[PDB]
Write an enzyme that holds these catalytic residues in place. Structure first.
Site, PDB file in Angstrom:
ATOM      1  CG  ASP A 131     -44.307  18.159   6.789  1.00  0.00           C
ATOM      2  OD1 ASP A 131     -45.307  18.693   6.842  1.00  0.00           O
ATOM      3  OD2 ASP A 131     -43.550  16.671   6.952  1.00  0.00           O
ATOM      4  CB  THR A 132     -46.190  23.391   5.720  1.00  0.00           C
ATOM      5  OG1 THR A 132     -47.590  23.074   6.923  1.00  0.00           O
ATOM      6  CG2 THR A 132     -46.855  23.593   4.461  1.00  0.00           C
ATOM      7  N   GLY A 133     -44.656  21.684   7.900  1.00  0.00           N
ATOM      8  CA  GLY A 133     -44.044  21.392   9.476  1.00  0.00           C
ATOM      9  C   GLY A 133     -42.673  21.137   9.280  1.00  0.00           C
TER      10      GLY A 133
HETATM   11  C1  LIG Z   1     -40.738  18.918  15.325  1.00  0.00           C
HETATM   12  C2  LIG Z   1     -41.822  19.505  14.096  1.00  0.00           C
HETATM   13  C3  LIG Z   1     -42.046  18.042  13.045  1.00  0.00           C
HETATM   14  C4  LIG Z   1     -42.731  16.610  13.486  1.00  0.00           C
HETATM   15  C5  LIG Z   1     -43.431  17.341  14.899  1.00  0.00           C
HETATM   16  C6  LIG Z   1     -41.018  17.903  12.119  1.00  0.00           C
HETATM   17  N1  LIG Z   1     -41.625  16.132  10.826  1.00  0.00           N
HETATM   18  C7  LIG Z   1     -42.670  17.394   9.798  1.00  0.00           C
HETATM   19  C8  LIG Z   1     -43.707  16.608   9.987  1.00  0.00           C
HETATM   20  O1  LIG Z   1     -44.718  16.781   9.010  1.00  0.00           O
HETATM   21  C9  LIG Z   1     -44.447  14.728  10.592  1.00  0.00           C
HETATM   22  C10 LIG Z   1     -43.605  14.586   9.232  1.00  0.00           C
HETATM   23  C11 LIG Z   1     -44.064  12.730   8.883  1.00  0.00           C
HETATM   24  C12 LIG Z   1     -45.447  12.466   8.674  1.00  0.00           C
HETATM   25  C13 LIG Z   1     -45.587   9.873   8.564  1.00  0.00           C
HETATM   26  C14 LIG Z   1     -44.545   9.673   8.859  1.00  0.00           C
HETATM   27  C15 LIG Z   1     -43.059  10.749   9.977  1.00  0.00           C
HETATM   28  C16 LIG Z   1     -43.122  12.328   9.324  1.00  0.00           C
HETATM   29  N2  LIG Z   1     -45.069  14.375  10.820  1.00  0.00           N
HETATM   30  C17 LIG Z   1     -46.166  14.392  11.964  1.00  0.00           C
HETATM   31  O2  LIG Z   1     -44.725  14.133  13.149  1.00  0.00           O
HETATM   32  O3  LIG Z   1     -46.988  14.204  12.317  1.00  0.00           O
HETATM   33  C18 LIG Z   1     -47.822  12.827  13.076  1.00  0.00           C
HETATM   34  C19 LIG Z   1     -48.891  13.612  13.667  1.00  0.00           C
HETATM   35  O4  LIG Z   1     -49.660  13.300  13.253  1.00  0.00           O
HETATM   36  C20 LIG Z   1     -49.606  11.803  12.060  1.00  0.00           C
HETATM   37  O5  LIG Z   1     -49.035  11.435  10.938  1.00  0.00           O
HETATM   38  C21 LIG Z   1     -48.355  11.026  10.402  1.00  0.00           C
HETATM   39  C22 LIG Z   1     -46.963  10.959  11.400  1.00  0.00           C
HETATM   40  C23 LIG Z   1     -47.883  11.563  12.618  1.00  0.00           C
HETATM   41  S1  LIG Z   1     -40.346  16.027  11.101  1.00  0.00           S
HETATM   42  O6  LIG Z   1     -40.879  14.334  10.093  1.00  0.00           O
HETATM   43  O7  LIG Z   1     -40.055  14.728  12.382  1.00  0.00           O
HETATM   44  C24 LIG Z   1     -39.007  16.910  10.646  1.00  0.00           C
HETATM   45  C25 LIG Z   1     -38.945  16.588   8.991  1.00  0.00           C
HETATM   46  C26 LIG Z   1     -38.050  17.689   8.379  1.00  0.00           C
HETATM   47  C27 LIG Z   1     -36.397  18.517   9.859  1.00  0.00           C
HETATM   48  N3  LIG Z   1     -35.354  18.878   9.577  1.00  0.00           N
HETATM   49  C28 LIG Z   1     -34.794  19.449  10.678  1.00  0.00           C
HETATM   50  S2  LIG Z   1     -36.073  18.816  11.556  1.00  0.00           S
HETATM   51  C29 LIG Z   1     -37.108  18.151  10.444  1.00  0.00           C
HETATM   52  C30 LIG Z   1     -37.984  17.376  11.313  1.00  0.00           C
END
Ligand SMILES: CCC(CC)CN(C[C@@H](O)[C@H](Cc1ccccc1)NC(=O)O[C@H]1CO[C@H]2OCC[C@H]21)S(=O)(=O)c1ccc2ncsc2c1
EC number: 3.4.23.16
Lengths: 99, 99
Positions: free
Chosen positions: A25-27
């Site tokens: 997860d690059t995000g």
């Molecule tokens: C702030 C930037 C994003 C949230 C916006 C950060 N996320 C990582 C995402 O990749 C998250 C990772 C993720 C994946 C699946 C379930 C829960 C979280 N994916 C996600 O939310 O995607 C959503 C949009 O498309 C949908 O597909 C997946 C969920 C939907 S996270 O899970 O909330 C996350 C991870 C480590 C971390 N360390 C400090 S803060 C922090 C936040």
């Protein structure tokens, strides 16, 4: 390897003697793993995303092997719906985005 | 280009004729942008993140240019903490993970 993004970038990891599936997860700034009973000291922390925050336990200097590439760093454990490998460890295995 | 992950993978996007900053998020299935005005129809949708579910406006077949690479796909608009580019658009620009 080269991983396309047609589907979720799930890979096998090894942590604390257990094998698991986790998202490259690059995000994700940090690495967040599903609830697990790791030994050692930890510190409370809260991380935010879509939908709000969750409470997690921060463990430091945790070894993780990601498809055979070893890494060691901070690992957060909490009620995440998905195992998430974040940038703190992705850098250690030489992972890059390419387009 | 090849993007390393020692810093959050932020890039400039152009959507609806406006420039914005967005995060390349391989852990996101979908693209979710902060509150903004977009032309065209939209349907109420729900998406879940690490902290729960949120209400978003779903815009289909929206033109969005990422680092000069054009994409046309679904864009969700709602109270996301950060503009994120998800796999639905990352695939369109030929983005892959490599280590
Ligand atoms: C702030 C930037 C994003 C949230 C916006 C950060 N996320 C990582 C995402 O990749 C998250 C990772 C993720 C994946 C699946 C379930 C829960 C979280 N994916 C996600 O939310 O995607 C959503 C949009 O498309 C949908 O597909 C997946 C969920 C939907 S996270 O899970 O909330 C996350 C991870 C480590 C971390 N360390 C400090 S803060 C922090 C936040």
């Amino acid at each position: 390897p080269q991983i396309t993004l047609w589907k979720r970038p799930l890979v096998t990891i090894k942590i604390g003697g257990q094998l698991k599936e986790a998202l490259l997860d690059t995000g994700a700034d940090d690495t967040v793993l599903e609830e697990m009973n790791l030994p050692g000291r930890w510190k409370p922390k809260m991380i935010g995303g879509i939908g709000g925050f969750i409470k997690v336990r921060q463990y430091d200097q945790i070894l993780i092997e990601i498809c055979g590439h070893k890494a060691i760093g901070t690992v957060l454990v909490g009620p995440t719906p998905v195992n998430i490998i974040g940038r703190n460890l992705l850098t250690q295995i030489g992972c890059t985005l390419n387009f």
